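To illustrate the input format used throughout this study, we show a single complete record. The first block contains the structure-token representation of the backbone; no residue identities are included at this stage. The design step must infer an amino acid for every position from geometry alone.
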């Protein structure tokens, strides 16, 4: 498993993005990009800014 913690709220702005709330625990799917990481947030998958999450 690889979990991350949402440090901030983020509202999706494009079709490949997903929304998260501060304090959400997300499943990390792909962290190859330095700026945008692919995560699973409940049942949805998509990108959020890498700077806004913290690896656990």
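Output of the design step:
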């Amino acid at each position: 498993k690889e979990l991350v913690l949402a440090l901030y709220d983020y509202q999706e702005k494009s079709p490949d993005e997903v929304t998260m709330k501060k304090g959400d625990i997300l499943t990390l799917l792909n962290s190859t990009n330095k700026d945008w990481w692919k995560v699973e947030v409940n049942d949805r998958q998509g990108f959020v800014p890498a700077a806004y999450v913290k690896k656990l």
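Structural context for interpreting the output: DSSP finds no helices and five strands in the chain. Residues 1-56 form a domain with the SH3 type barrels. fold (CATH 2.30.30.40).
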